[PDB]
Amino acid sequence: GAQVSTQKTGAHENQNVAANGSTINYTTINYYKDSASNSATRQDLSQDPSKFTEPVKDLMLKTAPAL
C-alpha cells in the first residue's frame, strides 16, 4: 500500500532533469482511515495564468493589433 515519489532536489543531487538515481525517491504510507489525516499532498505545478491575464472572448496573438 506504500507509495513512492520523487523528492525535491537538494544541494548535492543530480541534474535538473530529476531522473537520475534511486536515492532521490522517498516512501510514504497513509496510516489513517480518513484522508484528511494524510500529510500534505504533492504540489501541482500546473498553471494557467491566461485565466486571469488574458480572459478575452476573442483570442489575440501578441503581435496582432490590440484594437
Binding site: 486571469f52 480572459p55 478575452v56 472572448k57 476573442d58 489575440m60 493589433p65 490590440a66 484594437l67
Partner: protein, 261 residues
Amino acid sequence: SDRVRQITLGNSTITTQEAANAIVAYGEWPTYINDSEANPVDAPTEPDVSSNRFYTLESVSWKTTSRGWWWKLPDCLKDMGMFGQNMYYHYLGRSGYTIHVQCNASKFHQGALGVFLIPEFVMACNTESKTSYVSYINANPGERGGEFTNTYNPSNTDASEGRKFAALDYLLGSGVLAGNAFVYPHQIINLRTNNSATIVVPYVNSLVIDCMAKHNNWGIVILPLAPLAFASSPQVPITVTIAPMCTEFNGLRNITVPVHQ
C-alpha cells in the same frame, strides 16, 4: 474588425461602434446548473427572455470631481421588470450577467474609467465603534447605486450616517488599495479609444444557487483612473446596461417585500 460589436440576447441588442475586446471572466460563461449537482429538488423556473434581456440603470454624470460609483449587481435590478418580480417570488436563484458600460465623448475629452466586477464586494461600516454594521436599506441602494468618498468620517452613530458605508475611493471602501483592483475582471473605458466595454459574468458562489434577496454575488465598481478633462467641467454621462444570463429560480414562496425606505 474588433471595433464594432453587436451584442444581443432575449429581445434586446446593444450596438457599440467603438469598444475594446470583450472579457469573459475566468474564461467561463454562465450556464444552467447541470444535473450532476444541485441543492434544491423542485423543478426549476427558467424565465428565458423575460429575464435574459438588457435593462438600463439610471445614468450618472462624470464630473471632474467624482470619486467613483458603485452598484450591487442583483440588487440594482430588484425592482426592475420581470426579472425583479421573479427574484422576489423565488427563494433560490442563479444568474450570470452581461455588464456593458457606455460613456460617450468626443476625441477632445480625456480621462478614463476603470470598470471592475468584484464578486463579494464588501464595504466597511462608517461607524467606527461598530463592526460591519449597515442596514438592509443602506447596504442595498437599488438601481441608483452609491458613490465613493475621498474621505472617511465616522458619524459615531449619528442619524444612521454610521450605517452608511465608509467608501474611500483609494481604498475601494474596504481598506484595499485601488491599484490592485485590476486583479478582478475589468475593462477600461479610456475615452480617447473606446466608448464602451463589456464583461461576461458567470454566477459565482460557494453554492450552486442562493437567495438573491439576501446575497449579492457581485458588485460593480467604476472609478476614474484618469481625470476627466476638456478644454470647464463637462459632466460626461455614464450609463450602465445589464442583462441576466441563463437565469433560473427555484422554490416558490410568498412574494418577498423587503423593508422599504
